[PDB]
Design a protein around this ligand. Structure first.
Ligand SMILES: CCCCCCCCCCCCCCCCCC(=O)OC[C@H](CO[C@@H]1O[C@H](CO[C@H]2O[C@H](CO)[C@H](O)[C@H](O)[C@H]2O)[C@H](O)[C@H](O)[C@H]1O)OC(=O)CCCCCCCCCCCCCCCCC
Ligand code: CLA
Ligand code: CLA
Ligand code: CLA
Ligand code: CLA
Ligand SMILES: CCCCCCCCCCCCCCCC(=O)OC[C@H](CO[C@@H]1O[C@H](CS(=O)(=O)O)[C@@H](O)[C@H](O)[C@H]1O)OC(=O)CCCCCCCCCCCCCCC
Ligand code: KC2
Ligand SMILES: CC1=C(C#C/C(C)=C/C=C/C(C)=C/C=C/C=C(C)/C=C/C=C(\C)C#CC2=C(C)C[C@@H](O)CC2(C)C)C(C)(C)C[C@H](O)C1
Ligand SMILES: CC1=C(C#C/C(C)=C/C=C/C(C)=C/C=C/C=C(C)/C=C/C=C(\C)C#CC2=C(C)C[C@@H](O)CC2(C)C)C(C)(C)C[C@H](O)C1
Ligand SMILES: CC1=C(C#C/C(C)=C/C=C/C(C)=C/C=C/C=C(C)/C=C/C=C(\C)C#CC2=C(C)C[C@@H](O)CC2(C)C)C(C)(C)C[C@H](O)C1
Ligand SMILES: CC1=CCCC(C)(C)[C@H]1/C=C/C(C)=C/C=C/C(C)=C/C=C/C=C(C)/C=C/C=C(C)/C=C/C1=C(C)CCCC1(C)C
Ligand SMILES: CCCCCCCCCCCCO[C@H]1O[C@H](CO)[C@@H](O[C@H]2O[C@H](CO)[C@@H](O)[C@H](O)[C@H]2O)[C@H](O)[C@H]1O
Ligand code: SF4
Lengths: 160, 42, 176, 180, 153, 61, 176, 74, 171
C-alpha cells in the first residue's frame, strides 16, 4: 500500500506461483507414482504452495515483478520485516561480544593468557556464555562504573 | 578421560569447528521445521 | 480504662491523651502515621459530616429561593448551578489555607505544634472553661464519629430509595 | 572409593555427601567442571517447576477458570487457547520474580557472590515451616526427591500427550496402544 | 583447573563488592527474607501484610459489585456509575469512576464478593465419568495389560 | 621509581607509549637511559625489554 | 551502606540521600558517570515539562479556548491541526524561557532547577521549601510516567485520555 | 536493485575514504614506523624488520585507494 | 507414649496442656505448623461447623418468612445459591469478613503469644468463670463432633437431595 500492492492480491505473484508449480509438475510427469522422485517432487510442490500462501497472508507487499518487497523505514506495520529481526540480531550479537570480552579479561588475569586463548578453559567459557543473557544491563553497568571505557592517557597511540 | 585429551579437545580449532557445526545444525533445523521465513510473523 | 477490643493489646501510641481514646486501633494506623495528623483528619471528617447531616435534613424541606429543589438532597447538588458549586469549592479552599496558615501538608501543618483540630474558632467563647473544654472535646469527637456513620448511611440510603431520609422513614419499602 | 548408586564407577569427588539426595550419582562427572552449588540451584529450580507443572497438568484437566479460553482439558491445547496476552504477562512476571528473588545476582559469575547465598535458598519460607532444625533435613531430602520424581513425571506426561493426543487421566482411562 | 559457574565474580575477574551484607533471619508473608532497613520487619512485618490483605479483601467486596443500586422502580436495579452526569466540568458530563479502575463488565467477568460469580464460575469437570480401573466400559491401561496377557495370536 | 615498580611509558616513539611495564633495574652510573623496563606485550621487533630515562616513565598507582 | 529503594543492594556512592528526592535508587549507576547536578537539573526540567504536558493532555477534553474549539480533543490531532504560525510562536516563547536556563547552566552556578521563578513567595519557609522540593520532584516523575502512557494511549486509540476511559477501549488491537 | 547498488556505492566511497584518510593521518607516523615524516611521502618501505613493512607509505595508500576508486567508479 | 494411639510416641509439639489434647497427631502436622496457628484453626473450624450443623437442623425444622419465598423452598447449598443471587449471602460474607479482619489481628496476637488461641474474651453471660478448662473441653469436643456431623449432613444432602432430618425420616 505504501507504494506497492499487497502480495495476496497480485496477478504477478499468482503467475509466479503458477510457473513454479507447473515446472515442478512437468518434472513430476516423467516419474512413476509412489516412487521416491514422485514423492520428493510432490513435497516440493506442497512446500512451494505453502510458502506462497504464507507470504500472501503475511501482509507482504509485492511490486510489478511479482516479488515481495520490504519497507525498512520504521513503519510499525512492517516491523517484522527489518526491526524485530534486527532486534533479535542485536541481542545475539551483544551476547556474543559481551561473553567474548569477559573471557578476554578472565584470560588476561591468568598464569598464561596466551595458553588460555589457544587452549580454552571451557568451564569458564561456558560460565560467560551463560552470563551473556543480560548483556545490555551488564554492559551499561560496566560503562557507568567506568570498567568499560579506558582513559585516553592509558591507551597506546602512535606519534603525530 | 585423559586430561591431555580433554585439553586437546579444548584447543581453539576443535572448539571452533564443534561450535560452528552446532550453530550450523541449529540454523539448518530451524529452516527445516520453519522454512521460507523471510520475515518475523506479526 | 476499658479497651474497645478486649482480645487485642492496647495500641502503643494511644496513651489516652486524646479525647475519645478507648484503645481502638486494631489495624494500627497510629503505628504508621502521625497521630496529630490522624486526629486532625478525624475531626475534619466529623465536622464535615455533622454539617452534612444537618444539611441532608434541612435540604429535604427547605430550599433557598434562588435554587431549584431536587427530589432528594443528593440530587440538590446536581440541580444547583455549577459556577456556584465551584465558588463554594474555592471558598472552602481559601478557608482551609487561611485556617492552617498556608501549612496544609503533613510536613508543615503542625510545624507550630498546634493542637489537632484547633483552628482558633471560638466566636462565642464556648470553650473558655477548661473542664467544659475537655467534656466538649469528648462530645465533639463522639458526635463527629456518629455523624460520619450517619452521613454514610443517609447518603447511601438516599441513593438507593431515591427518597429523603424522613420520607423514607415515613414510607419504608424493603429493597426486596 | 566407589559410588553408592553405581557400584562399579568411582565416587564423584566433588559430591561429598553433604547435599540432600546425594547417592554418588554423577557418572558423567558434571560436578568436576560445574560448581555443585550452581548445579543444585538448577536442580531445585527444575524440580520445583516440574512439581508445579505436573500438578497443573493434572488439575487443570478437572477444574478450570471460567471461560472458553480457559476451558481445555488437553494441556498442550490449553497452551494455545489460553489468552496470549495473559501468557506474556506470566512470562514477564516470571522474569521479574527471577530478578528480585535472586537479588540482581542472576548470572554464573555473581549468583553466589554473597557467602550467605546457599544453593536453592531464595528466601522463600512464607509460613516459616523450615525454621525447625529437626525437620529441616527431612524437608530438604523430600524436596529434592519430589523435584526429581516430578521432573520425570512431567517429561513422561508431555511426551505421552504428544503421542496419545489426549489428557493424562483421559489416556489412562481410555488407553489406546500406539499404532504408527 | 577452574570449576565453572562458581557464582563468585572474583573467580571470573568480574566487578564485585568487598563487604557483602549479612543475611538477617526474618520473614514477611507475601514478602521475602533478606537485608532490610532497621525497623522494616517491625513496621511492615507478616502482621502488616496479612492485615492489609484482609482490609484489601473487605474493600474488594464493595468494589466487585460496584454500581448504583436503586429500588425506585420497585425492584433492585443496577446502573453503572458512568451513567451519572457531573456538573461543572465543561464538556465531560460523564467522568471516570471506579469502573475505570476495575473494568469487570467490559471483559465479561461476573465478579462477586468472593472472586467468582454465578456467570463466571470455576468449572469442575469430572474426569472419571463412568470409567473403572478394570472390567469397565472404558478401556483403561489396566484393561489393555489384561487383554494383552490374555490375548491369542 | 625503584626496582619492581609499575611505570607507564611517556616516550612517543615507543611501542609501549602510555603502557605499563615493570622496572627491572635502575643504573646509577650516570648513563643516558638508566632505567630498564620489562613488558608483557612484545614489540614488533620481538623484544619485551627496553632502556628508558627517568623523565620518560611515570609511576602508576 | 544499603540503598533505601533496593534494600538488598549497596547505596550508590554519589547518592548519599542528602539531595531532594533521593532514596538511593540508581540500579544502573547513572550518577557515577554523569554529573549529578546536571542529572538533577535534567530530571527537574523533564518533570516540569511532563507536569504541564499531563495537565494539557486532559484540559482540552474539559474546556477549549474559543479560538481552538474546532481542534480535536485528541492532543496529537490538535497538534497536527494547530498550524505552523502558532507552533512557531510557542517555540519562540519556549526558546525565550530556555535562554535563562542556558545562562544558568553554562554561565552560572545555582541550585539545580533554580531559575529565580518564585513570584508568590511560597518557598521562603525552609520546611515548606523542603516539602515543596521533594513534591516537585515526585510529581514530575509521576507526570513523566503518566504523560508517556498518555501519548502511547493516544497513539493507539486515536482519542483523548478521558474519552478512552469512558469508552473503555483500554485494550489494544495491534500496532497502528 | 537501485537500493542494493546504492549501498554498494556507499561501501566503495567509504572504503576509498578509509584508505585515503588512513594514509593521510598515518603519513607522519605510526607505531610501526614512528618516524615516517623523516622518510617522506613515497619511500619504498622500511625493510623486513618489525614483521615486514611493505606498503607503509602514504603513497602506497594512494596506490591502494586508486584500485578502490576504480572499483567504485566502475 | 500417646494416650490415643498407644503404640505411637507422643507428638513433640503436643504437651497435653491444651484442651482436647490426647496425643492424637499420627501424621505430625504439629511438627510442620505452629501449634498456636493449628489451635486457632481448630477452634475456628469447631465454631463454624457447630453453627453450620445447628443451622442445617434448624433450617429443616423452621424457615423464616420471606426467606422461603426468596429461595423457593430450596435447602442447604441450593439455598446458598438462591440467596447469593438474592444478595443475603453477600451481607453475611461482608460482615463475616469484617469480623475476620480483627480475626487476623487476633491471630497475629496469638502468634506473638499475647493471646490464647481462640480467646476473643466473649462471655457476656459469664458462663466460663466457674470452670473454664471444663467449658473449653466441652467446646472442643462438641466442635469436633459438629465438624463430623456437618460433613455427614452436607454429603447426605449431596447423595439424596434431602436435609438431615428429612433424610432420617426418609432414608
Ligand atoms: C504404595 C503402597 C500402597 C499400595 C496399597 C495397595 C495394595 C494393593 C491392594 C489392591 C488395591 C487396588 C487399588 C485399586 C483401586 C482402584 O482402582 O480405585 C478405583 C476405585 C473407584 O471406586 C470404585 O469405582 C467403581 C467404578 O465403577 C465402574 O468400574 C467398576 C470396576 O472398575 C465396574 O465396572 C462398575 O460397573 C463401573 O461402573 C464403582 O463404581 C465404585 O465407585 C468403587 O468400587 O477407588 C475407590 O473406590 C476410591 C477409594 C478412595 C481411594 C482411597 C485410597 C487412599 C486411602 C488413604 C486414606 C485416606 C483416604 C481419605
Ligand atoms: C533516514 C531517515 C529516517 C530515520 C532515521 C527514521 C527513523 C524512524 N522511523 Mg522512519 N521514515 C523515514 C525516514 C527515516 N525514519 C522516511 C523517509 C519515511 C517515509 C517514507 C519514514 C516513514 C516512517 C513511518 C511511517 C514511521 C517511521 C518510524 C520510524 C521510527 C521507528 C522506531 C520507533 O518509532 O521507535 C520508537 C520506540 C522507542 C523510542 C523506544 C522503544 C522501547 C522498547 C524497546 C520498545 C524511527 C525513529 C515509525 C515511528 O513511529 O516513528 C516515530 C513510523 O511509524 N518512519
Ligand atoms: C541472518 C542475517 C545476518 C547475518 C548473517 C549477519 C552477519 C553479521 N552482522 Mg549483522 N545484522 C543483521 C542481520 C545479520 N547480520 C540485521 C538484521 C541487522 C540490523 C539490526 C544487523 C546489524 C548489524 C550490525 C550493527 C553489525 C552487524 C555485524 C555483522 C557481522 C559481524 C557480527 C559479529 O561479529 O557478531 C559478534 C559480535 C561482536 C563482535 C560484538 C560487537 C558487534 C555487535 C554487532 C554489537 C552489538 C551491540 C551494540 C550495542 C549495537 C550498537 C549498534 C549501533 C552502533 C548501530 C556479521 C557478518 C557487525 C559488522 O558488520 O561489523 C563490521 C556489526 O557491527 N550486523
Ligand atoms: C499490573 C497489573 C495487572 C493488570 C492491570 C492486569 C490486567 C489484566 N490481566 Mg493480568 N496479570 C498480572 C498483572 C496485571 N494484570 C500479573 C502480575 C500476572 C502474572 C502473575 C498476570 C497474569 C495474567 C493472565 C495469565 C491473564 C491476565 C489477564 C488480564 C486481563 C484480565 C481482564 C479481566 O477482566 O479479568 C477479570 C478476572 C479476574 C479479576 C479474575 C482473577 C483470576 C486470578 C487467577 C485470581 C487484564 C488485561 C487475562 C487476559 O489477558 O485476558 C484476555 C489473562 O489471561 N493476567
Ligand atoms: C507540554 C505543554 C503543552 C503543549 C505542548 C500544549 C499544546 C497545545 N495546547 Mg495546551 N495546555 C497546556 C500545556 C500544553 N499545551 C496546559 C498546562 C494546559 C492547561 C491550562 C493547556 C490547556 C490547553 C487548552 C485549554 C487548549 C490547549 C490547546 C493547545 C494546542 C494549541 C495551543 C494553545 O492554545 O495552547 C494553549 C495553552 C495554554 C493556555 C497553557 C500552556 C502554557 C502554560 C501557562 C505553561 C496545542 C497542541 C488548544 C487546543 O487545540 O485544544 C484542542 C486549547 O484549546 N491547551
Ligand atoms: C519477555 C521477558 C522480559 C521481561 C522480564 C523482565 C525481567 C528482567 C530482569 C533483568 C535483571 O534481572 O537484571 C539484573 C541486573 C544485574 O546486573 C548486574 O549487577 C551487578 C551488581 S548488582 O547485581 O546490581 O549488585 C553488576 O556488577 C553486573 O555487572 C550487572 O550485570 O540488575 C541490575 O543491575 C539493575 C536492574 C535494573 C532495574 C530496573 C528494572 C525495572 C524493570
Ligand atoms: C461558599 C459560598 C459562597 C461564597 C462565600 C460566595 C461569595 C460571593 C461573593 C463575595 C466574596 C460575591 C461578590 C459573590 C457573587 C456572586 N455569587 Mg457567590 N458565593 C458563594 C456561593 C455561591 C453560589 C452557590 C452561587 C453564587 C453565585 C454568585 C453570583 C452570580 C449569580 C448569577 O449567576 O445570577 C454572584 C454575582 C451564583 C451563580 O454564580 O450562579 C450561577 C450561585 O449559584 N455564589 N459570591
Ligand atoms: C515450599 C513452601 C510452600 C509450598 C509449596 C508447594 C506449593 C508445594 C507443592 C508441591 C507439589 C505440587 C509437588 C508435586 C509433586 C509431583 C510429583 C512428584 C509428580 C510425580 C509424577 C509421576 C512420577 C508421574 C507420572 C505419571 C506419568 C508421567 C505417566 C502417567 O501415565 C502416570 C503418571 C501420572 C503416574 C508453601 C507455599 C506451603 C509455603 C511454605 O512456607 C514453603
Ligand atoms: C512554580 C510556582 C508556581 C507554579 C505552578 C504551577 C503552575 C504548577 C503546576 C503543576 C502541575 C500542572 C502539575 C501537574 C501534575 C500532573 C501529574 C502528576 C499527572 C499525572 C498523571 C497520571 C499519573 C496519569 C495518568 C493516567 C494515565 C497515564 C492513563 C489514563 O488512562 C489514566 C490516568 C489519567 C490516571 C506559581 C505559578 C504558583 C508561582 C509560585 O511562586 C511557584
Ligand atoms: C459463645 C457464648 C455463647 C454462645 C453461643 C452459642 C450460639 C453457641 C452455639 C452452639 C451450637 C450451635 C452448637 C452446635 C453443636 C452441634 C453439633 C455438635 C452437631 C452435631 C451433629 C451431628 C453429630 C450429626 C449428625 C448427623 C449427620 C452426620 C447426618 C444426618 O443425616 C444425621 C445426623 C443429624 C445424626 C453465649 C451466647 C451462650 C454467651 C456465652 O457467654 C458464650
Ligand atoms: C515526535 C513524535 C513522533 C511520533 C509520536 C508523536 C507524534 C506523539 C511525537 C511525540 C512523541 C513523544 C513526545 C513521545 C514521548 C514518549 C514518552 C514520554 C514515553 C515514556 C515512557 C515511559 C516508560 C516506559 C516508563 C517506564 C517505567 C517503569 C518500567 C517503572 C517501573 C518501576 C516500578 C514499577 C517500581 C519501582 C521501580 C521502577 C523502575 C520505577
Ligand atoms: C492498570 C494500569 C497499568 C498500566 C501499565 C500497562 C502497561 C502496558 C499495558 C499493555 C496493554 C495490555 O496488553 C493487552 O494486550 C492484549 C492484546 O491482545 C489484550 O488482549 C485482549 O484484551 C482484552 C481482554 O482483556 C480483549 O478485549 C481484547 O480483544 C484482546 O485483544 C490483553 O487485554 C492484554 O494482554
Ligand atoms: S618485499 Fe616488502 S619489504 Fe621486502 S623489500 Fe620488497 S617491499 Fe621492502
Amino acid at each position: 500500500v505504501a507504494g506497492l500492492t499487497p502480495c495476496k492480491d497480485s496477478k504477478d505473484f499468482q503467475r509466479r506461483l503458477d510457473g513454479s508449480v507447473k515446472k515442478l509438475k512437468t518434472r513430476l510427469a516423467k516419474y512413476e507414482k509412489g516412487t521416491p522422485p514422485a514423492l520428493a517432487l510432490e513435497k516440493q510442490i506442497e512446500r512451494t504452495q505453502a510458502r506462497f500462501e504464507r507470504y500472501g497472508k503475511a501482509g507482504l507487499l509485492c511490486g510489478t515483478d511479482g516479488l515481495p518487497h520490504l519497507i525498512t523505514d520504521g513503519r510499525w506495520s512492517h516491523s517484522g520485516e527489518f526491526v524485530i529481526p534486527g532486534l533479535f540480531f542485536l541481542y545475539i550479537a551483544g551476547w556474543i561480544g559481551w561473553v567474548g570480552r569477559s573471557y578476554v579479561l578472565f584470560a588476561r588475569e591468568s598464569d598464561k593468557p596466551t595458553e588460555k586463548e589457544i587452549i580454552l578453559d571451557v568451564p569458564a567459557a561456558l560460565s560467560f556464555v551463560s552470563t551473556g543473557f543480560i548483556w545490555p544491563v551488564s554492559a551499561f553497568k560496566e560503562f557507568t562504573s567506568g570498567n568499560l571505557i579506558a582513559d585516553e592517557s592509558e591507551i597506546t597511540v602512535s606519534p603525530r | 578421560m585423559d586430561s591431555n585429551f580433554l585439553k586437546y579437545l579444548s584447543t581453539a580449532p576443535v572448539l571452533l569447528t564443534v561450535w560452528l557445526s552446532f550453530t550450523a545444525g541449529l540454523v539448518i533445523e530451524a529452516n527445516r521445521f520453519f522454512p521460507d521465513m523471510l520475515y518475523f510473523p506479526m | 480504662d476499658d479497651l474497645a477490643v478486649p482480645f487485642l493489646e492496647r495500641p502503643p501510641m494511644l496513651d489516652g491523651s486524646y479525647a475519645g481514646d478507648i484503645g481502638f486501633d486494631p489495624v494500627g494506623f497510629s503505628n504508621y502515621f502521625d497521630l496529630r495528623w490522624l486526629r486532625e483528619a478525624e475531626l475534619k471528617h466529623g465536622r464535615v459530616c455533622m454539617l452534612g447531616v444537618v444539611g441532608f435534613l434541612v435540604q429535604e424541606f427547605v430550599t433557598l429561593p434562588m435554587f431549584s429543589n431536587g427530589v432528594t438532597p443528593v440530587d440538590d447538588f446536581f440541580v444547583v448551578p455549577a459556577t456556584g458549586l465551584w465558588q463554594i469549592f474555592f471558598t472552602i479552599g481559601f478557608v482551609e489555607a487561611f485556617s492552617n496558615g498556608f501549612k496544609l501538608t503533613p510536613s508543615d501543618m503542625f510545624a507550630d505544634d498546634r493542637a489537632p483540630g484547633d483552628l482558633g474558632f471560638d466566636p462565642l467563647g464556648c470553650g473558655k472553661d477548661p473542664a467544659a473544654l475537655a467534656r466538649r472535646q469528648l462530645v465533639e469527637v463522639k458526635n463527629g464519629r456518629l455523624a460520619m456513620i450517619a452521613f454514610g448511611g443517609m447518603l447511601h440510603q438516599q441513593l438507593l430509595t431515591k427518597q429523603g431520609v424522613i420520607e423514607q422513614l415515613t414510607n419504608f419499602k424493603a429493597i426486596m | 572409593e566407589k559410588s553408592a548408586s553405581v557400584p562399579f564407577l568411582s565416587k564423584p569427588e566433588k559430591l561429598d555427601g553433604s547435599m540432600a539426595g546425594d547417592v554418588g550419582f554423577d557418572p558423567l562427572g558434571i560436578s568436576y567442571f560445574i560448581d555443585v552449588k550452581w548445579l543444585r540451584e538448577a536442580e531445585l529450580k527444575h524440580g520445583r517447576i516440574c512439581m508445579l507443572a505436573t500438578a497443573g497438568i493434572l488439575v487443570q484437566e478437572v477444574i478450570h477458570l471460567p471461560g472458553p479460553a480457559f476451558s481445555s482439558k488437553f494441556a498442550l491445547d490449553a497452551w494455545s487457547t489460553a489468552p496470549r496476552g495473559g501468557m506474556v504477562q506470566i512470562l514477564i512476571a516470571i522474569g521479574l520474580i527471577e530478578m528480585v528473588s535472586n537479588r540482581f545476582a542472576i548470572t554464573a559469575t555473581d549468583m553466589f557472590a554473597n557467602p550467605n547465598r546457599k544453593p536453592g535458598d531464595l528466601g522463600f519460607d512464607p509460613l516459616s515451616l523450615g525454621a525447625n532444625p529437626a525437620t529441616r533435613a527431612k524437608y530438604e531430602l523430600s524436596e529434592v526427591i519430589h523435584g526429581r520424581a516430578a521432573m520425570m513425571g512431567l517429561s513422561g506426561m508431555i511426551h505421552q500427550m504428544i503421542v496419545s493426543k489426549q489428557p493424562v487421566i483421559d489416556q489412562l482411562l481410555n488407553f489406546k496402544p500406539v499404532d504408527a | 583447573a577452574t570449576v565453572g559457574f562458581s557464582g563468585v565474580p572474583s573467580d571470573f575477574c568480574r566487578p564485585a563488592p568487598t563487604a557483602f551484607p549479612a543475611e538477617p533471619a526474618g520473614m514477611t508473608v507475601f514478602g521475602a527474607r533478606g537485608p532490610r532497613a532497621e525497623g522494616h520487619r517491625d513496621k511492615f512485618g507478616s502482621r502488616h501484610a496479612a492485615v492489609s490483605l484482609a482490609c484489601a479483601a473487605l474493600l474488594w467486596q464493595p468494589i466487585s459489585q460496584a454500581g448504583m443500586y436503586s429500588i425506585d422502580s420497585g425492584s433492585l436495579a443496577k446502573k453503572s456509575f458512568s451513567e451519572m452526569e457531573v456538573p461543572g466540568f465543561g464538556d465531560a458530563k460523564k467522568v471516570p469512576t471506579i469502573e475505570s479502575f476495575f473494568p469487570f463488565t467490559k471483559n465479561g467477568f461476573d465478579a462477586s464478593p468472593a472472586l467468582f460469580g454465578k456467570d463466571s464460575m470455576i468449572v469442575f469437570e469430572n474426569p472419571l465419568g463412568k470409567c473403572g480401573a478394570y472390567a469397565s466400559s472404558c478401556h483403561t491401561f489396566l484393561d489393555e495389560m489384561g487383554d494383552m496377557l490374555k490375548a491369542t495370536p | 621509581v625503584k626496582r619492581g615498580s609499575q611505570v607507564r611509558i611517556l616516550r612517543k616513539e615507543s611501542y609501549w607509549y602510555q603502557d605499563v611495564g615493570t622496572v627491572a633495574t635502575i643504573d646509577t652510573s650516570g648513563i643516558r637511559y638508566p632505567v630498564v623496563v620489562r613488558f608483557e606485550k612484545v614489540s614488533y621487533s620481538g623484544v619485551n625489554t627496553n632502556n628508558f630515562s627517568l623523565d620518560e616513565v611515570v609511576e602508576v598507582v | 551502606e544499603m540503598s533505601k529503594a533496593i534494600p538488598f543492594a549497596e547505596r550508590p556512592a554519589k547518592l548519599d540521600g542528602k539531595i531532594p528526592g533521593d532514596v538511593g535508587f540508581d540500579p544502573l549507576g547513572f550518577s557515577d558517570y554523569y554529573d549529578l547536578k546536571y542529572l538533577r537539573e535534567a530530571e527537574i526540567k523533564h518533570g516540569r515539562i511532563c507536569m504541564l504536558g499531563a495537565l494539557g493532555w486532559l484540559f482540552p477534553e474539559f474546556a477549549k479556548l474559543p479560538q481552538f474549539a474546532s481542534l480535536s480533543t485528541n492532543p496529537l490531532k490538535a497538534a497536527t491541526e494547530l498550524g505552523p504560525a502558532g507552533w512557531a510562536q510557542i517555540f519562540i516563547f519556549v526558546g525565550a524561557l530556555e535562554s535563562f536556563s542556558y545562562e544558568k547552566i553554562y554561565y552560572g552556578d545555582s541550585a539545580p532547577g533554580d531559575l529565580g521563578f518564585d513570584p508568590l513567595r511560597l518557598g521562603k519557609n525552609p520546611v515548606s521549601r523542603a516539602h515543596y522540593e521533594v513534591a516537585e520532584i515526585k510529581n514530575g516523575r509521576l507526570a513523566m510516567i503518566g504523560l508517556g502512557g498518555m501519548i502511547h494511549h493516544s497513539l493507539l486509540t486515536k482519542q483523548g485520555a478521558i474519552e478512552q476511559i469512558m469508552s473503555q477501549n483500554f485494550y489494544p488491537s495491534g500496532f497502528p | 536493485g537501485d537500493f542494493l547498488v546504492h549501498h554498494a556505492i556507499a561501501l566503495g566511497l567509504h572504503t576509498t575514504a578509509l584508505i585515503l584518510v588512513k594514509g593521510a593521518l598515518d603519513a607522519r607516523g605510526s607505531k610501526l614506523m614512528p618516524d615516517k615524516k623523516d622518510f617522506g611521502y613515497s619511500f619504498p618501505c622500511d625493510g623486513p624488520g618489525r614483521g615486514g613493512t611493505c606498503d607503509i607509505s602514504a603513497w602506497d595508500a594512494f596506490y591502494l585507494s586508486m584500485f578502490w576508486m576504480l572499483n567504485t567508479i566502475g | 507414649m500417646s494416650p490415643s494411639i498407644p503404640f505411637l510416641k507422643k507428638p513433640d509439639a503436643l504437651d497435653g496442656t491444651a484442651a482436647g489434647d490426647i496425643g492424637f497427631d499420627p501424621l505430625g502436622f504439629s511438627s510442620l505448623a505452629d501449634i498456636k496457628f493449628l489451635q486457632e484453626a481448630e477452634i475456628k473450624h469447631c465454631r463454624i461447623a457447630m453453627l453450620a450443623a445447628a443451622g442445617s437442623i434448624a433450617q429443616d425444622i423452621f424457615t423464616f418468612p420471606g426467606y422461603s419465598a426468596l429461595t423457593g423452598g430450596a435447602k442447604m447449598t441450593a439455598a446458598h445459591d438462591k440467596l447469593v443471587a438474592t444478595g443475603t449471602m453477600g451481607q453475611i460474607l461482608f460482615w463475616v469478613s469484617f469480623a475476620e479482619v480483627f480475626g487476623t489481628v487476633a491471630l497475629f496476637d496469638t502468634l506473638d503469644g499475647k493471646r490464647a488461641p481462640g480467646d476473643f474474651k466473649f462471655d457476656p453471660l459469664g458462663m466460663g468463670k466457674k470452670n473454664m478448662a471444663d467449658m473449653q473441653l466441652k467446646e472442643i469436643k462438641n466442635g469436633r463432633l459438629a465438624m463430623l456431623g456437618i460433613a455427614g449432613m452436607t454429603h447426605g444432602y449431596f447423595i439424596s437431595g434431602k436435609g438431615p432430618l428429612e433424610l432420617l425420616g426418609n432414608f
